[PDB]
RNA sequence: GGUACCGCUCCAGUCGUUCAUGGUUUUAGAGCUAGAAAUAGCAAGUUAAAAUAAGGCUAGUCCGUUAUCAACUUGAAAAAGUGGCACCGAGUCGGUGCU
DNA sequence: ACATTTTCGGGATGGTCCTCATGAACGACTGGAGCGGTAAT
DNA sequence: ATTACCGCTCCAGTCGTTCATGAGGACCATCCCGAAAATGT
């Protein structure tokens, strides 16, 4: 039947709630038949409920997981690449090479050959370190070599240089020399002075290198050079030439008075090509400055990162490492002698003992630099003869470990320098190197471009390449085995802007000539004209529109009325007296691409010919899509009759970026099957007036409605996956939608297959801020301003600040944190906010908060060092109280603060701390825009109507901004921190409001999403806003819109509270929709109503199998070895083995001295690994695990979050492999929840209206609730742990801390509401007492536990029999 | 009562392609004196190489950090489908009656 | 030949330690706010 | 041929209303209970 009920849902990050409301009854109570045992007659449940689920790894964590797979694969392949080059050659000349490489692993008993790494004999193996203290000395030896080295030490050096290959970040050949840098600074100044004799720049003996070497910002380095070298300004020619060498992108358009942009950069191979175009126009005499600037940048890079001069060695990189390496042993020997003489007593302790981060732990362990320096620093300060040792601490030159990240970030080019020498020196000793050098230099330089990508032998979705035959895919003989044109085309067809009306096609480039013609013809259509014979204004015809485009738009970019009157009408149409109307003095439309083409080609033969426009569109499409300049050449070859050799060489520079929103097919590729005309044909000439482009597509007058029916009306298939394959990358939103559509689909089916009137859905994010804009940013300012006014200042009253200044995050971070960082407490300033770096609190991590409160403005992040130990402990000690002052002024959040105290308490959500100090944040919830569309797509899959457009199922998305007044009316305090049954009541209220809104049409409407400010009437009494505080509208007064439409209460009066009468008309037919004598009482009755239908989702664990590390520290049976036959005691197994689910089977395992069979059912964990054969054949699996004698009907599978109910009155849940989870819902009176929230609230706040007056008096008169709460808790311990254990400590603490602040105790009490959750046995700090951490191994009372299998939808429940359990 | 398609700009989030290092595991790594011996002290310390998700298609110079995955019936199998209401009440969800 | 004392072994339990992440060159999307376009009956 | 049925304002710019909402497992130290053997009667 048509309409009987409505449903509502509330979608969170890791939970979905729902509720069903029906006109015929007020009690959401319904029965189901018990499956299996039938322990209860017919179990009833509440229709209001919620589903809990695990959210998984979000955005940047998913990013890191795919990156991590490709990450080591690259390093592994590079090691394998050079191995394939030399291994076979070494095996051919040395028979003993092969066996040593193969027998390098495993125990003696399985080993067939001795290791002998370098020489081939134990006697000679330990002769190496006598001349070579490190790999870097062998590198110097081979680079400066005059003699022959063994192929094992040659491969040893070459293998180091491909494992330690270095980064190919910047394109082009950089100068590997540091011989005479000083000269380059003098020659640039003198060359400028010779070319510009009007105002010479004076060097004045200034050392420019000293300014650049110092750790200053790029802006400050430029400024200091301009201040010390007089003759030119920071924004002048010389300043922009310095900026280029600083690695910036200057634009010399304003410098050479150019009509077009002239940006230069040193990061691209085409820079030399751009200089050829530039010098062709400004002349040869300016070449020296740009070539010297390029070479100086190369010289400065090596000077800064190596700090070693050339010619004393041809290996300055290896030499740079050696100097410090030797100094480490000399400084350590010195300090060791000083400690022996001054501190005999602590001599063993200082060097041997890991616990304080000493020398032994530092060398053999992973001890932090800052902790190591911290320990030895006051020791060196107290000791005599340590002056030089104290300097090395500040320089960071004291005992730095050779292998560390800071010594790893080396570029590919300086590595090629030394490698070219390693190969060249040995060419007259090994002739094989002369032939292999070509292949070696290529793989050392090699990098995969976008248009080639994956070179996979097999067939798969992401295999873009077409392979010719079974040979190779290596760059060697590349064109003979694969075609980069085929991979470039398949790459572009998959990755580019796509047409949203054509699923398999793509849009035109933004430089399309057709795209530009479309806008010009629209403006020409608006034009009316008057002539010498024509009496009244008439519109332009198609031939006249074409004539104006052919004449005026092809001779000047923009057209004006004078041009039409003096040129077009007098020349083409031959009228002296004419007039143009419909437009002003000029048009908005213009041709941009057309005149750009004339300037580059400089001809007219490619213009007016009918076929040439299609030729130019194909060429611009190619120029936008492909950087590959040989692909551009091949496009130009088919049209070579229009393009000579010079223009084709000039075009080889760069891409025409950006696309339009329409493809060509729609515009002039689809013809009307009755008139024969395209949309472009109708645009040029048709009937009176026009409509919007999408309106003309939908228009019933054209035959394009058929194309809509064949494409759009068809829709997606039966499978849900196909409908949720769009919207959101978040696994939290994805799973929320996945379960939401399933719940809605099932609710409509089980409700007698009747259709709901409304489906009301909410979906939100962890919004930490408003977005950029004066409708958003302007309010973010208030969060800063309150902190400023709390601290105190006269600045805000003395001088007003314009609202357009503070619009972005970087300007907000400065005033939120003040002029100081949050890690080392060093100075920040306004002029340095775009010059200093910004960090994330938890980058590339499991969960990420929505925007500005997840980030922090810092000075340098090098202190992070991939560790969880803040090196600025002493800073945290004073800043912790400062950070609490910031939370009190609401400048930083509770989660932001707690991430800096993690070591003391771990995790556990405290997110809505704002609730007692200020909650002000109106959320947009942009995700909700397409949620209804995905559901609507499945729900209204029916076409039994003659284009009636009548929907049967209406899905409505709701904003939570309307719920606030309903929380007040029904006295709801719903912070999830004190209630994990949160979504159940939200979804109910959502169904109430969304249904309420449609029963009588709204009195005050607003525009789509944006709404309020867009359309409103001018009122002077809201104009005082902008002048005083800034723009404001109904977004602030949204509560008054609710009062206008419903008239529920009067908010203009304090004291006695009176509201709208109990029995009032609410429907469009004059009927009563909601009744306060029945409905209102029922809503508040549901709040405390027993047995709400809430469950943790049933599944089994898939994905995330293990972490890429080995833990030989573990040795239990659950450890999965890295290789099957390798001993876990030596070579270990993989970090964190993942169990998909468990199976309950009677054991065949023998116990004790008599070897008795365990004839009782036991838990066997099924791993994601072993599952792969278990599901296919469980018999062989069970026999291998010790469960040999078993029958099919005796095997019971236990999925993830399986439930148990004990006959002794307890409820429990299964984790994964057999571990015990808490379970059991919380039955507790509502009088405790309201008290604790309000008790903290009314600490420093006083009441006034009737309700607030009684709430304050309630907390003040009734302080006995804390004593009743510990009494209720002592009765829940008995249902979980049995013994009270630590509640004697908690009761003692509750009697002890009665003289402590009400708020500060209520701030952490939220951790005791874990009783509502089915897991989370949390440990936390209360006030001065920190509670013990416990976990549940298993249930002793096995035979009393009944196995429960429930549906994910929360409907039917299966109870499994106890007669099969056994026991002997 | 009674609108549709968007231009220009700035900022943010979602992210993708590409490349490198280190943490860490493992093997080779020639010592002296006292004491039955456990055990202790001193001489003495300078390095290199290999490797890092089970498992497997298309059996790889390749892919893999995932969802439905409970009872029940039909289907070789892939795959698909069914889940009662009137009527009263609410401290660990019960009852009258029909189906 | 049987019961008690005796030592060694297993399970339930809690305390402490363990954890593969960094980012710029090059390049694109949705999406919102403020400056706006164009109007009929 | 028209633009809120309702938001009609204060000796002054004020803080505040609601929400997305919680790391556990392995190894080692330890106490209590149970089985087979040696000894006494
Ligand atoms: Mg919500
Ligand atoms: Mg950072
Ligand atoms: Mg909610």
PDB file of C-alpha atoms (C1' of nucleotides) and ligand atoms in Angstrom, chain A residues 10-12 762-764 925 960 982-983 986 990, chain D residues 19-20, ligand 1:
ATOM      1  CA  UNK A  10      21.745   9.291  11.423  1.00  0.00           C
ATOM      2  CA  UNK A  11      25.097   8.346   9.868  1.00  0.00           C
ATOM      3  CA  UNK A  12      28.300   8.835  11.907  1.00  0.00           C
ATOM      4  CA  UNK A 762      21.986  13.004   8.245  1.00  0.00           C
ATOM      5  CA  UNK A 763      25.706  12.673   7.533  1.00  0.00           C
ATOM      6  CA  UNK A 764      28.478  14.762   9.069  1.00  0.00           C
ATOM      7  CA  UNK A 925      27.937  19.064   5.646  1.00  0.00           C
ATOM      8  CA  UNK A 960      21.616  19.082  12.409  1.00  0.00           C
ATOM      9  CA  UNK A 982      23.771   8.054  20.375  1.00  0.00           C
ATOM     10  CA  UNK A 983      22.477   7.534  16.824  1.00  0.00           C
ATOM     11  CA  UNK A 986      19.052  11.094  16.553  1.00  0.00           C
ATOM     12  CA  UNK A 990      15.363  13.120  12.184  1.00  0.00           C
TER      13      UNK A 990
ATOM     14  C1'  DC D  19      27.546  17.804  16.532  1.00  0.00           C
ATOM     15  C1'  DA D  20      31.743  13.808  14.212  1.00  0.00           C
TER      16       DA D  20
HETATM   17 MG1  LIG E   1      24.647  13.607  12.978  1.00  0.00          MG
END
